[PDB]
């Protein structure tokens, strides 16, 4: 019953995502047995304050569908494990979207983003070893109502959290 419009981890080639500002969100590459990279995205600017870091996915086709589900898998640091004095540390990030036919270009400045929700992290991790921190993945799913155009973009805004977006999946349910 499920049909993927986007699946960040199984993509062939580059996802073609953009960050604003250009520092901030980083794209990570992990190579598999066939040297094919799995891409994820992470940001961890908990040093200072006043973070507004954006990550725009490229145009996603709805494929005539009307209601879609965004499935997110991510990790996120325990803000308590970080020193209390250095700067901002949040445990939640935001997700927006905007519908469009205009396939792809120089974007963020003039688009109205529709806030979908504030994503919170069921489980944060500390420097309790990595490798066992895929164990600390949490999953959050959200669906968005009646679509107009022939496609949409998803936008993630970080305001000072320590997160790894390990999977982003969009799909309609026919």
PDB file of C-alpha atoms in Angstrom:
ATOM      1  CA  UNK A   1       0.000   0.000   0.000  1.00  0.00           C
ATOM      2  CA  UNK A   2       3.019   2.344   0.175  1.00  0.00           C
ATOM      3  CA  UNK A   3       4.701   4.227  -2.684  1.00  0.00           C
ATOM      4  CA  UNK A   4       7.931   6.206  -2.156  1.00  0.00           C
ATOM      5  CA  UNK A   5       8.175   9.657  -3.755  1.00  0.00           C
ATOM      6  CA  UNK A   6      11.592  10.047  -2.089  1.00  0.00           C
ATOM      7  CA  UNK A   7      13.945   7.873  -0.018  1.00  0.00           C
ATOM      8  CA  UNK A   8      17.159   9.739   0.817  1.00  0.00           C
ATOM      9  CA  UNK A   9      19.213   6.588   1.576  1.00  0.00           C
ATOM     10  CA  UNK A  10      18.504   4.485  -1.517  1.00  0.00           C
ATOM     11  CA  UNK A  11      18.855   7.334  -4.017  1.00  0.00           C
ATOM     12  CA  UNK A  12      21.226   6.689  -6.944  1.00  0.00           C
ATOM     13  CA  UNK A  13      23.568   9.625  -7.451  1.00  0.00           C
ATOM     14  CA  UNK A  14      23.248  12.890  -5.520  1.00  0.00           C
ATOM     15  CA  UNK A  15      20.147  13.947  -3.602  1.00  0.00           C
ATOM     16  CA  UNK A  16      20.926  17.497  -4.746  1.00  0.00           C
ATOM     17  CA  UNK A  17      20.069  19.165  -1.435  1.00  0.00           C
ATOM     18  CA  UNK A  18      21.142  22.726  -0.510  1.00  0.00           C
ATOM     19  CA  UNK A  19      22.017  24.353   2.834  1.00  0.00           C
ATOM     20  CA  UNK A  20      21.608  27.955   4.057  1.00  0.00           C
ATOM     21  CA  UNK A  21      23.797  29.209   5.254  1.00  0.00           C
ATOM     22  CA  UNK A  22      26.481  27.182   3.510  1.00  0.00           C
ATOM     23  CA  UNK A  23      28.194  26.293   6.730  1.00  0.00           C
ATOM     24  CA  UNK A  24      25.713  24.696   9.099  1.00  0.00           C
ATOM     25  CA  UNK A  25      24.146  21.556   7.659  1.00  0.00           C
ATOM     26  CA  UNK A  26      26.764  19.107   6.371  1.00  0.00           C
ATOM     27  CA  UNK A  27      26.293  16.217   3.966  1.00  0.00           C
ATOM     28  CA  UNK A  28      27.885  12.988   5.111  1.00  0.00           C
ATOM     29  CA  UNK A  29      28.976  10.091   2.913  1.00  0.00           C
ATOM     30  CA  UNK A  30      29.164   6.476   4.025  1.00  0.00           C
ATOM     31  CA  UNK A  31      30.423   4.009   1.456  1.00  0.00           C
ATOM     32  CA  UNK A  32      28.945   0.512   1.004  1.00  0.00           C
ATOM     33  CA  UNK A  33      30.372  -2.802  -0.279  1.00  0.00           C
ATOM     34  CA  UNK A  34      29.990  -1.512  -3.845  1.00  0.00           C
ATOM     35  CA  UNK A  35      31.598   1.836  -2.999  1.00  0.00           C
ATOM     36  CA  UNK A  36      28.211   3.506  -3.471  1.00  0.00           C
ATOM     37  CA  UNK A  37      27.801   6.335  -0.912  1.00  0.00           C
ATOM     38  CA  UNK A  38      24.819   6.549   1.376  1.00  0.00           C
ATOM     39  CA  UNK A  39      24.219  10.219   2.100  1.00  0.00           C
ATOM     40  CA  UNK A  40      22.879  11.621   5.341  1.00  0.00           C
ATOM     41  CA  UNK A  41      22.835  15.152   6.701  1.00  0.00           C
ATOM     42  CA  UNK A  42      23.964  16.523  10.042  1.00  0.00           C
ATOM     43  CA  UNK A  43      24.468  19.797  11.916  1.00  0.00           C
ATOM     44  CA  UNK A  44      25.926  20.476  15.380  1.00  0.00           C
ATOM     45  CA  UNK A  45      26.430  24.203  15.974  1.00  0.00           C
ATOM     46  CA  UNK A  46      25.724  24.128  19.723  1.00  0.00           C
ATOM     47  CA  UNK A  47      28.819  26.218  20.416  1.00  0.00           C
ATOM     48  CA  UNK A  48      27.358  29.722  20.191  1.00  0.00           C
ATOM     49  CA  UNK A  49      23.775  30.879  19.693  1.00  0.00           C
ATOM     50  CA  UNK A  50      21.223  32.292  17.286  1.00  0.00           C
ATOM     51  CA  UNK A  51      21.207  29.357  14.914  1.00  0.00           C
ATOM     52  CA  UNK A  52      18.943  29.279  11.876  1.00  0.00           C
ATOM     53  CA  UNK A  53      20.393  26.588   9.639  1.00  0.00           C
ATOM     54  CA  UNK A  54      18.282  25.410   6.690  1.00  0.00           C
ATOM     55  CA  UNK A  55      18.406  22.279   4.515  1.00  0.00           C
ATOM     56  CA  UNK A  56      16.284  22.269   1.375  1.00  0.00           C
ATOM     57  CA  UNK A  57      15.584  19.048  -0.469  1.00  0.00           C
ATOM     58  CA  UNK A  58      15.278  19.299  -4.235  1.00  0.00           C
ATOM     59  CA  UNK A  59      11.948  19.227  -6.068  1.00  0.00           C
ATOM     60  CA  UNK A  60       9.910  16.131  -5.245  1.00  0.00           C
ATOM     61  CA  UNK A  61       7.144  14.928  -7.556  1.00  0.00           C
ATOM     62  CA  UNK A  62       3.828  14.115  -5.892  1.00  0.00           C
ATOM     63  CA  UNK A  63       3.019  11.941  -8.911  1.00  0.00           C
ATOM     64  CA  UNK A  64      -0.593  13.102  -8.948  1.00  0.00           C
ATOM     65  CA  UNK A  65      -1.001  12.097  -5.317  1.00  0.00           C
ATOM     66  CA  UNK A  66      -2.689  14.466  -2.888  1.00  0.00           C
ATOM     67  CA  UNK A  67      -1.706  13.427   0.641  1.00  0.00           C
ATOM     68  CA  UNK A  68       1.863  12.407   1.516  1.00  0.00           C
ATOM     69  CA  UNK A  69       3.736  11.123   4.557  1.00  0.00           C
ATOM     70  CA  UNK A  70       7.157  12.401   5.599  1.00  0.00           C
ATOM     71  CA  UNK A  71       9.029   9.776   7.608  1.00  0.00           C
ATOM     72  CA  UNK A  72      12.128  10.991   9.457  1.00  0.00           C
ATOM     73  CA  UNK A  73      14.832   8.999  11.174  1.00  0.00           C
ATOM     74  CA  UNK A  74      17.454  10.900  13.145  1.00  0.00           C
ATOM     75  CA  UNK A  75      19.850  10.976  16.074  1.00  0.00           C
ATOM     76  CA  UNK A  76      20.198  13.843  18.544  1.00  0.00           C
ATOM     77  CA  UNK A  77      22.609  14.694  21.377  1.00  0.00           C
ATOM     78  CA  UNK A  78      21.620  14.950  25.046  1.00  0.00           C
ATOM     79  CA  UNK A  79      21.975  18.677  25.688  1.00  0.00           C
ATOM     80  CA  UNK A  80      22.735  17.864  29.321  1.00  0.00           C
ATOM     81  CA  UNK A  81      25.885  15.986  28.338  1.00  0.00           C
ATOM     82  CA  UNK A  82      27.100  19.295  26.898  1.00  0.00           C
ATOM     83  CA  UNK A  83      28.554  21.986  29.211  1.00  0.00           C
ATOM     84  CA  UNK A  84      26.117  24.491  30.701  1.00  0.00           C
ATOM     85  CA  UNK A  85      27.500  27.856  29.690  1.00  0.00           C
ATOM     86  CA  UNK A  86      28.915  27.582  26.210  1.00  0.00           C
ATOM     87  CA  UNK A  87      25.795  28.347  24.184  1.00  0.00           C
ATOM     88  CA  UNK A  88      22.432  27.328  22.773  1.00  0.00           C
ATOM     89  CA  UNK A  89      21.479  23.655  22.864  1.00  0.00           C
ATOM     90  CA  UNK A  90      18.045  22.488  21.717  1.00  0.00           C
ATOM     91  CA  UNK A  91      16.605  18.993  21.324  1.00  0.00           C
ATOM     92  CA  UNK A  92      14.008  19.872  18.709  1.00  0.00           C
ATOM     93  CA  UNK A  93      14.139  21.010  15.057  1.00  0.00           C
ATOM     94  CA  UNK A  94      11.505  22.271  12.575  1.00  0.00           C
ATOM     95  CA  UNK A  95      10.153  20.981   9.251  1.00  0.00           C
ATOM     96  CA  UNK A  96       8.422  23.060   6.543  1.00  0.00           C
ATOM     97  CA  UNK A  97       7.359  22.507   2.919  1.00  0.00           C
ATOM     98  CA  UNK A  98       6.262  24.443  -0.154  1.00  0.00           C
ATOM     99  CA  UNK A  99       4.335  23.219  -3.223  1.00  0.00           C
ATOM    100  CA  UNK A 100       5.693  24.005  -6.692  1.00  0.00           C
ATOM    101  CA  UNK A 101       6.039  23.089 -10.372  1.00  0.00           C
ATOM    102  CA  UNK A 102       9.157  25.207 -10.904  1.00  0.00           C
ATOM    103  CA  UNK A 103      11.543  22.258 -10.791  1.00  0.00           C
ATOM    104  CA  UNK A 104      14.846  23.579  -9.378  1.00  0.00           C
ATOM    105  CA  UNK A 105      16.825  26.783  -8.773  1.00  0.00           C
ATOM    106  CA  UNK A 106      18.209  29.498  -6.460  1.00  0.00           C
ATOM    107  CA  UNK A 107      15.600  29.234  -3.780  1.00  0.00           C
ATOM    108  CA  UNK A 108      15.327  29.999  -0.075  1.00  0.00           C
ATOM    109  CA  UNK A 109      15.003  33.781  -0.095  1.00  0.00           C
ATOM    110  CA  UNK A 110      11.496  34.214  -1.535  1.00  0.00           C
ATOM    111  CA  UNK A 111       9.397  31.196  -0.679  1.00  0.00           C
ATOM    112  CA  UNK A 112       6.742  30.915   1.978  1.00  0.00           C
ATOM    113  CA  UNK A 113       7.407  27.779   3.956  1.00  0.00           C
ATOM    114  CA  UNK A 114       4.559  25.909   5.540  1.00  0.00           C
ATOM    115  CA  UNK A 115       5.463  24.734   9.014  1.00  0.00           C
ATOM    116  CA  UNK A 116       4.529  21.080   9.313  1.00  0.00           C
ATOM    117  CA  UNK A 117       5.715  20.522  12.856  1.00  0.00           C
ATOM    118  CA  UNK A 118       8.390  20.789  15.507  1.00  0.00           C
ATOM    119  CA  UNK A 119      10.134  17.416  15.635  1.00  0.00           C
ATOM    120  CA  UNK A 120      11.154  16.237  19.078  1.00  0.00           C
ATOM    121  CA  UNK A 121      13.486  13.395  19.939  1.00  0.00           C
ATOM    122  CA  UNK A 122      12.008  10.460  21.886  1.00  0.00           C
ATOM    123  CA  UNK A 123      15.571   9.496  22.750  1.00  0.00           C
ATOM    124  CA  UNK A 124      18.761  11.559  22.953  1.00  0.00           C
ATOM    125  CA  UNK A 125      22.234  10.060  23.067  1.00  0.00           C
ATOM    126  CA  UNK A 126      25.389  10.945  25.007  1.00  0.00           C
ATOM    127  CA  UNK A 127      29.018  10.021  24.319  1.00  0.00           C
ATOM    128  CA  UNK A 128      27.891   6.546  25.336  1.00  0.00           C
ATOM    129  CA  UNK A 129      29.790   4.797  22.491  1.00  0.00           C
ATOM    130  CA  UNK A 130      28.934   5.228  18.777  1.00  0.00           C
ATOM    131  CA  UNK A 131      28.238   2.088  16.732  1.00  0.00           C
ATOM    132  CA  UNK A 132      25.618   1.458  19.390  1.00  0.00           C
ATOM    133  CA  UNK A 133      24.109   4.831  18.521  1.00  0.00           C
ATOM    134  CA  UNK A 134      22.134   3.630  15.559  1.00  0.00           C
ATOM    135  CA  UNK A 135      20.463   2.100  18.607  1.00  0.00           C
ATOM    136  CA  UNK A 136      19.524   5.693  19.410  1.00  0.00           C
ATOM    137  CA  UNK A 137      17.649   6.380  16.185  1.00  0.00           C
ATOM    138  CA  UNK A 138      14.176   7.755  16.679  1.00  0.00           C
ATOM    139  CA  UNK A 139      11.484   7.867  14.043  1.00  0.00           C
ATOM    140  CA  UNK A 140       8.819  10.498  13.485  1.00  0.00           C
ATOM    141  CA  UNK A 141       6.174  10.482  10.761  1.00  0.00           C
ATOM    142  CA  UNK A 142       3.982  13.373   9.599  1.00  0.00           C
ATOM    143  CA  UNK A 143       1.444  13.689   6.775  1.00  0.00           C
ATOM    144  CA  UNK A 144       0.394  16.785   4.829  1.00  0.00           C
ATOM    145  CA  UNK A 145      -3.097  17.552   3.465  1.00  0.00           C
ATOM    146  CA  UNK A 146      -4.442  18.300  -0.064  1.00  0.00           C
ATOM    147  CA  UNK A 147      -1.550  19.052  -2.472  1.00  0.00           C
ATOM    148  CA  UNK A 148      -1.945  21.644  -5.245  1.00  0.00           C
ATOM    149  CA  UNK A 149       1.053  21.751  -7.585  1.00  0.00           C
ATOM    150  CA  UNK A 150       2.928  18.906  -9.280  1.00  0.00           C
ATOM    151  CA  UNK A 151       5.648  18.803  -6.636  1.00  0.00           C
ATOM    152  CA  UNK A 152       6.962  20.103  -3.334  1.00  0.00           C
ATOM    153  CA  UNK A 153      10.126  20.861  -1.439  1.00  0.00           C
ATOM    154  CA  UNK A 154      10.859  19.883   2.136  1.00  0.00           C
ATOM    155  CA  UNK A 155      12.815  22.226   4.385  1.00  0.00           C
ATOM    156  CA  UNK A 156      14.486  21.495   7.680  1.00  0.00           C
ATOM    157  CA  UNK A 157      15.380  24.373   9.988  1.00  0.00           C
ATOM    158  CA  UNK A 158      17.900  23.835  12.807  1.00  0.00           C
ATOM    159  CA  UNK A 159      17.868  26.400  15.608  1.00  0.00           C
ATOM    160  CA  UNK A 160      20.776  25.005  17.605  1.00  0.00           C
ATOM    161  CA  UNK A 161      20.324  21.260  17.981  1.00  0.00           C
ATOM    162  CA  UNK A 162      22.906  18.498  17.534  1.00  0.00           C
ATOM    163  CA  UNK A 163      21.216  16.256  14.986  1.00  0.00           C
ATOM    164  CA  UNK A 164      21.932  13.674  12.339  1.00  0.00           C
ATOM    165  CA  UNK A 165      19.163  13.245   9.750  1.00  0.00           C
ATOM    166  CA  UNK A 166      19.847   9.621   8.933  1.00  0.00           C
ATOM    167  CA  UNK A 167      16.744   8.983   6.780  1.00  0.00           C
ATOM    168  CA  UNK A 168      14.051  11.131   5.198  1.00  0.00           C
ATOM    169  CA  UNK A 169      11.276   9.273   3.392  1.00  0.00           C
ATOM    170  CA  UNK A 170       8.251  10.601   1.516  1.00  0.00           C
ATOM    171  CA  UNK A 171       5.455   8.339   0.304  1.00  0.00           C
ATOM    172  CA  UNK A 172       1.752   8.219  -0.557  1.00  0.00           C
ATOM    173  CA  UNK A 173      -0.509   5.356   0.591  1.00  0.00           C
ATOM    174  CA  UNK A 174      -2.938   4.638  -2.300  1.00  0.00           C
TER     175      UNK A 174
END
